[PDB]
Enzyme design. Sequence first.
Site, PDB file in Angstrom:
ATOM      1  N   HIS B 160       0.845  -1.206   0.000  1.00 55.98           N
ATOM      2  CA  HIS B 160       0.000   0.000   0.000  1.00 55.98           C
ATOM      3  C   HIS B 160       0.872   1.244   0.000  1.00 55.98           C
ATOM      4  O   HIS B 160       0.749   2.135  -0.850  1.00 55.98           O
ATOM      5  CB  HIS B 160      -0.858  -0.057   1.280  1.00 55.98           C
ATOM      6  N   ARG B 173      -2.685  13.417   3.787  1.00 54.44           N
ATOM      7  CA  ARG B 173      -3.461  12.269   4.274  1.00 54.44           C
ATOM      8  C   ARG B 173      -3.647  12.314   5.791  1.00 54.44           C
ATOM      9  O   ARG B 173      -2.765  12.807   6.539  1.00 54.44           O
ATOM     10  CB  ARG B 173      -2.770  10.963   3.867  1.00 54.44           C
ATOM     11  N   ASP B 182     -19.314   3.738  14.947  1.00 55.25           N
ATOM     12  CA  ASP B 182     -20.253   3.864  13.834  1.00 55.25           C
ATOM     13  C   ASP B 182     -20.051   2.581  13.029  1.00 55.25           C
ATOM     14  O   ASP B 182     -19.415   1.641  13.520  1.00 55.25           O
ATOM     15  CB  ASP B 182     -19.960   5.109  12.994  1.00 55.25           C
ATOM     16  N   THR B 221     -18.445   8.660  -0.922  1.00 57.64           N
ATOM     17  CA  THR B 221     -17.154   9.323  -1.144  1.00 57.64           C
ATOM     18  C   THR B 221     -17.482  10.787  -1.171  1.00 57.64           C
ATOM     19  O   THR B 221     -18.313  11.216  -2.005  1.00 57.64           O
ATOM     20  CB  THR B 221     -16.553   8.893  -2.481  1.00 57.64           C
TER      21      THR B 221
HETATM   22  C1  HEM Z   1       0.033   9.381  -0.104  1.00 56.37           C
HETATM   23  C2  HEM Z   1      -0.973   8.542   0.105  1.00 56.37           C
HETATM   24  C3  HEM Z   1      -0.993   7.426   1.162  1.00 56.37           C
HETATM   25  C4  HEM Z   1      -0.032   6.972   1.981  1.00 56.37           C
HETATM   26  C5  HEM Z   1       1.437   7.497   2.030  1.00 56.37           C
HETATM   27  C6  HEM Z   1      -0.602   5.921   2.769  1.00 56.37           C
HETATM   28  C7  HEM Z   1       0.096   5.227   3.742  1.00 56.37           C
HETATM   29  C8  HEM Z   1      -0.464   4.465   4.712  1.00 56.37           C
HETATM   30  C9  HEM Z   1       0.238   3.878   5.815  1.00 56.37           C
HETATM   31  C10 HEM Z   1       1.798   3.999   6.060  1.00 56.37           C
HETATM   32  C11 HEM Z   1      -0.651   3.213   6.552  1.00 56.37           C
HETATM   33  C12 HEM Z   1      -0.441   2.396   7.826  1.00 56.37           C
HETATM   34  C13 HEM Z   1      -0.740   3.184   9.105  1.00 56.37           C
HETATM   35  C14 HEM Z   1      -0.395   2.418  10.336  1.00 56.37           C
HETATM   36  O1  HEM Z   1       0.717   1.851  10.428  1.00 56.37           O
HETATM   37  O2  HEM Z   1      -1.193   2.374  11.280  1.00 56.37           O
HETATM   38  C15 HEM Z   1      -1.976   3.373   5.927  1.00 56.37           C
HETATM   39  C16 HEM Z   1      -3.168   2.884   6.376  1.00 56.37           C
HETATM   40  C17 HEM Z   1      -4.360   2.953   5.701  1.00 56.37           C
HETATM   41  N1  HEM Z   1      -4.509   3.565   4.470  1.00 56.37           N
HETATM   42 FE1  HEM Z   1      -3.205   4.639   3.413  1.00 56.37          FE
HETATM   43  N2  HEM Z   1      -1.978   5.705   2.456  1.00 56.37           N
HETATM   44  C18 HEM Z   1      -2.180   6.666   1.433  1.00 56.37           C
HETATM   45  C19 HEM Z   1      -3.355   6.797   0.754  1.00 56.37           C
HETATM   46  C20 HEM Z   1      -4.487   6.062   1.002  1.00 56.37           C
HETATM   47  C21 HEM Z   1      -5.731   6.107   0.267  1.00 56.37           C
HETATM   48  C22 HEM Z   1      -5.880   6.964  -1.012  1.00 56.37           C
HETATM   49  C23 HEM Z   1      -6.582   5.281   0.909  1.00 56.37           C
HETATM   50  C24 HEM Z   1      -8.041   4.944   0.599  1.00 56.37           C
HETATM   51  C25 HEM Z   1      -8.814   5.809  -0.053  1.00 56.37           C
HETATM   52  C26 HEM Z   1      -5.920   4.729   2.068  1.00 56.37           C
HETATM   53  C27 HEM Z   1      -6.455   3.875   2.984  1.00 56.37           C
HETATM   54  C28 HEM Z   1      -5.873   3.404   4.116  1.00 56.37           C
HETATM   55  C29 HEM Z   1      -6.595   2.666   5.086  1.00 56.37           C
HETATM   56  C30 HEM Z   1      -8.075   2.238   5.125  1.00 56.37           C
HETATM   57  C31 HEM Z   1      -5.581   2.356   6.135  1.00 56.37           C
HETATM   58  C32 HEM Z   1      -5.841   1.575   7.393  1.00 56.37           C
HETATM   59  C33 HEM Z   1      -5.444   0.148   7.016  1.00 56.37           C
HETATM   60  C34 HEM Z   1      -5.357  -0.671   8.254  1.00 56.37           C
HETATM   61  O3  HEM Z   1      -4.724  -0.184   9.214  1.00 56.37           O
HETATM   62  O4  HEM Z   1      -5.931  -1.794   8.296  1.00 56.37           O
HETATM   63  N3  HEM Z   1      -4.673   5.252   2.071  1.00 56.37           N
HETATM   64  N4  HEM Z   1      -1.780   4.136   4.820  1.00 56.37           N
END
Ligand code: HEM
Lengths: 238, 238, 238, 238, 238
Positions: B160, B173, B182, B221
């Site tokens: 991801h 973000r 919820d 959204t």
């Molecule tokens: C520059 C853009 C993004 C970066 C750098 C990024 C990076 C990350 C990172 C590092 C985490 C893990 C957080 C943790 O360790 O607790 C995370 C979690 C998450 N991200 Fe992103 N993300 C980005 C964009 C997006 C987008 C566009 C979406 C959905 C529309 C998204 C959805 C999620 C979701 C739902 C989680 C929670 C996943 C989980 O913990 O089970 N992210 N993201």
Amino acid sequence: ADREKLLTESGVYGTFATFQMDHDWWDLPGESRVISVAEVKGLVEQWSGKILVESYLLRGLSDHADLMFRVHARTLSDTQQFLSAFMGTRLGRHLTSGGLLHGVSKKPTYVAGFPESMKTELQVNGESGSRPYAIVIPIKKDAEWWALDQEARTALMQEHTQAALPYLKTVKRKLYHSTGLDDVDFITYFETERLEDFHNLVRALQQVKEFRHNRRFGHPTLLGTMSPLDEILEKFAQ
Amino acid sequence: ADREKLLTESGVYGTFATFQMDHDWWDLPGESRVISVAEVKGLVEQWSGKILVESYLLRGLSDHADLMFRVHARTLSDTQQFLSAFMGTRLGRHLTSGGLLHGVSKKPTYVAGFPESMKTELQVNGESGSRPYAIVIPIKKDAEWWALDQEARTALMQEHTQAALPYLKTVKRKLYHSTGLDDVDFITYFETERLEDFHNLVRALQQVKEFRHNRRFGHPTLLGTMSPLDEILEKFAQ
Amino acid sequence: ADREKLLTESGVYGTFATFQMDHDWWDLPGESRVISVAEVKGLVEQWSGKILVESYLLRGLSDHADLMFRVHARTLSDTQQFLSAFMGTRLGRHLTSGGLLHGVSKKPTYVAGFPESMKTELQVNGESGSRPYAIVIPIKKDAEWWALDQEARTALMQEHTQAALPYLKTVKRKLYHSTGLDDVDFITYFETERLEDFHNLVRALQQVKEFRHNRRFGHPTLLGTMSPLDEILEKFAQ
Amino acid sequence: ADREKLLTESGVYGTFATFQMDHDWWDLPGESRVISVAEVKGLVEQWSGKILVESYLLRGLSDHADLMFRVHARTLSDTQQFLSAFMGTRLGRHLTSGGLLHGVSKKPTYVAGFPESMKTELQVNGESGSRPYAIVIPIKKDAEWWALDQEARTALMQEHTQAALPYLKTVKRKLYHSTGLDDVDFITYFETERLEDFHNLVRALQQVKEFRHNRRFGHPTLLGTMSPLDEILEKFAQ
Amino acid sequence: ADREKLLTESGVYGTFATFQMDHDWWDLPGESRVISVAEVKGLVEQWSGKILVESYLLRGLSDHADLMFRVHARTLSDTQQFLSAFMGTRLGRHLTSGGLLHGVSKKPTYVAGFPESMKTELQVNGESGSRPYAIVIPIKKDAEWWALDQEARTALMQEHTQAALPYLKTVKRKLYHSTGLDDVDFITYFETERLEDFHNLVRALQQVKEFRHNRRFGHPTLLGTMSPLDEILEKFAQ
Ligand code: HEM
Ligand code: HEM
Ligand code: HEM
Ligand code: HEM
Ligand code: HEM
């Protein structure tokens, strides 16, 4: 104490009734609303020999809900009569009734099959705290769950409990058996002072196999603040 | 400052409250609508000590939605009191809710298991830019996701992150942990000056294995423009 | 006599019509609402003979519902004309519909394949009880159900019946065949004085193999109390 | 003239905004409604230097929908401002939104990989026709689609195109890339004088492998007639 | 003749438009409602040259539905203009839509592949009957259906036909091809004097392999009585 009985004894019905206040209520003069509030307070007092009514502010926490009553009664016909009377009050006539869920308290089915230490730990259920948050989550199990025999379900419920152990003190819990009285199998009810602990509890439970057998979970997940009827209704009167 | 503490610190609640203006609002004389707008502005200032309220114009970008508040508070009880007060104002009483979601900020779960260099890259989050677009996407994971162990989920989240790397500067973000408050697991929130960059980011993430595990993605959204509240409310005073 | 006939004979249509009173009703002058209630009582009286109308208070037991009619008629046209005349009354004009389901009574399909001892015990169906609780549960079967042959379905229905045997006295049952008349296959209807008996009955049936074949079960599950109509309508003239 | 550019160039936003008229609109005097129609026409003219607005009559062809605009703009911010101004007009104040979808035009992803003969054939895109029927079908792909390599998706899109070839002249097509701006991946837009040809085209595509990969197709499928704005608005001034 | 040609010929569009009358229509004075209902008959006669309009009373048989029109036309633009014209009558101005579906009549796809005996049997289609019940069931097939070859689909449709043969006399049928004009693939329409026969026909068809390919079946299943318009109109003038 009789309150304590309704809240703890088996064979007691719990009803969760949610309402939204109409816009034209607030477009009403506070003086008439103060009278309307006294009417409701009066009705609750009138019914206090037969049923227990507790009140929760959902406004600003749960979408499309302002007020919830949790009602305990030994007969659902008593609950019906109270709710019908409440909805016909001046205040009640300006509520848009929402959700309505019922279930009965039962002696535990699985606990007897758990390790002694777990049975001992389960003696703990919440703690002192004023005006907690409250959460209500309706649940429907999948057909696969009911097909499992009692030993298998006992094993899965032990796993559920194991994941929950760190939250025995910080989250108060109550389970209502709902099947056949509405579209869900269980109504789960919780009180906590610390919502992040509740959030962590649910996350812990998401990992267990029993949580994979939920055909429906929430919809709605009701979140509110528990408080005296007078205090809530006063907010509605100003 | 304390604004930034609320926007960056763990343990802070974020609330997303969407509203649509009822048509009967427009029947009110313009002068009355002018006074009502003024009232909301003062309520928001009164709460400026306890909570942070930011406003977004959804009108013309999100279906069935005019206004969104993003509210940060250390206690959800404060958010409740603010939103209930807001909904009780004359302007507020002419709004219908189009959504209400809450989540808490948490220290990351997966990032410590990432390569050291990835940890460093994640220090970058957006860039300075006035009145950006904002996007909110609620997400619910499937049961299979929660059944995976921590090592597996860490690898999926590394993928991801890897796909997201090109967008670290162009899309700001923020992640809110929603389970139990919820009917969703996460609220994701983004700011960008270029929507085609956000579009390309989501497309990149659609390919990663973690994507299949999104049982619910959006619905709604929410797309808006970030704006001072006065300029939003002006429109309803015309 | 003829009433007993409508309630027991094959080839009779049963219709379930649910209603909720709108708010602006309560804005109508008191004695205006007293007079409007009188119209409905005479209308129901006229249609006697042609059709059988029984009334249920859902107010305070079923979400978004105040009244249910169960109507029996040898000709569904007659039910249509009555319901349309009912909805056109001044009282009826202020009601919103919360459901409309039809089914026909049929001679049993499977019972002839059961053991003689089972055929004998199925001769029991409820017992004398005034103003019981009533429950209505619509059911849609999955495609796999209809793909099974008669022998297979007979065995499954024997298992159903076996699980239900303990409840034959305390729960009255009636089955309506609905396929093609609305979006469900069956309407099930029950009366009981003991809701925990009904709850335990449904739990027993959840375990049987036939259960997994219910693609839709409830939605809505209607719970009410059986009542003379005048007592229900009375509530709306207060 | 820049109209042709907005309709054909990459990097342009297309927005589909659907509206239904409140019933109370008709209680307004005809004179009031005449003035309100001029306000809308003039607003569109005022915006004609910045954006392209085309209008469609959905009344009597799409359920719960009277009017659709298709708006092309270089930035969604301009579209937002137009639609907000529109919703603030005397007429707009009486409209309920029945849909809002956005997407960007892009240079094709797959066509470069097709046979030379197919590339040549694709240069044809509809034919002259006044006041065609228009159809809008929103589409969300499944996760499996995005998991496929580019070579595989190219082959699937060649099969798609192969099936569509007979319809190049009788059905005009436009594709908009929507992911992240609302709940769908694509907005498809078609014009035709011959609805049976469009029906037969969709039937042809239902057989291709790419079809099974649609998580959502339609909901709504919008069907309308393309018309000068003045002709649509005349109906409402009656 | 002209009527019979529209009802029987290929390439004719069938439209199904469902309406529910507003509550506040009854707040209107009786005489105002009396004039209102008068202008509808003249509109249908005005359009008698171009299109066929047939009327059905859904009130009291179909949930949230009072009136259905089945409209046949060779040009859907004509139907649009009629329904638009209709919705802009004083009566139509008070109608909320409860469904709008379109489909085209086609010569059969599969019948040529059937046994000659089955082809001959299919020449029968219902019998002359006054004021029959009418049922409308929208159907969407799954992707797997469209993936099957013509030979396979023919065999499945022969099985469908075989199960339906006993009902040829007592249930009139008509098939509309809807794909691309709304969210379903087929509109099925039936007339019968004997609902239990229709019920039994659908039951026979639930068993055939083609049934498990119905991704959507009903939703809504519309049930009504075929009626002269004056007979429906009259009820709203009381
Ligand atoms: C520059 C853009 C993004 C970066 C750098 C990024 C990076 C990350 C990172 C590092 C985490 C893990 C957080 C943790 O360790 O607790 C995370 C979690 C998450 N991200 Fe992103 N993300 C980005 C964009 C997006 C987008 C566009 C979406 C959905 C529309 C998204 C959805 C999620 C979701 C739902 C989680 C929670 C996943 C989980 O913990 O089970 N992210 N993201
Ligand atoms: C500290 C908190 C919790 C503890 C100690 C706990 C423990 C238990 C126990 C011991 C049972 C079995 C009762 C019996 O033997 O009849 C049970 C049942 C159940 N619990 Fe929990 N639980 C907690 C939190 C939750 C949460 C957060 C949920 C979901 C929101 C939940 C959902 C359920 C459900 C649906 C059942 C009924 C399952 C069945 O009987 O088939 N529990 N829980
Ligand atoms: C005392 C309780 C009950 C008894 C004695 C009972 C018995 C039976 C019997 C003998 C049949 C077959 C009728 C025939 O041969 O055509 C049947 C059918 C059916 N029962 Fe029950 N039942 C009971 C309770 C319930 C409950 C609580 C439900 C669901 C809420 C239910 C749902 C059904 C359904 C859907 C059918 C139709 C199945 C089919 O024909 O495919 N029953 N029942
Ligand atoms: C004359 C009729 C049609 C032609 C010539 C045609 C051709 C094409 C071509 C060449 C592409 C690939 C564009 C690219 O390379 O980026 C495409 C994409 C697409 N088409 Fe069609 N098409 C037609 C009709 C339809 C219809 C009727 C639908 C559905 C209602 C449809 C749905 C789509 C979708 C959803 C995509 C995007 C798929 C993706 O890029 O992942 N098309 N079409
Ligand atoms: C006496 C009653 C019936 C007869 C004689 C009959 C016969 C047929 C025949 C011969 C066809 C094939 C038409 C063709 O070749 O293009 C057909 C198609 C179809 N029928 Fe029936 N049918 C009856 C009742 C029903 C019912 C009750 C339904 C569903 C409620 C139904 C649903 C359909 C559907 C959806 C199709 C189109 C299937 C397709 O072309 O993919 N029929 N029917």
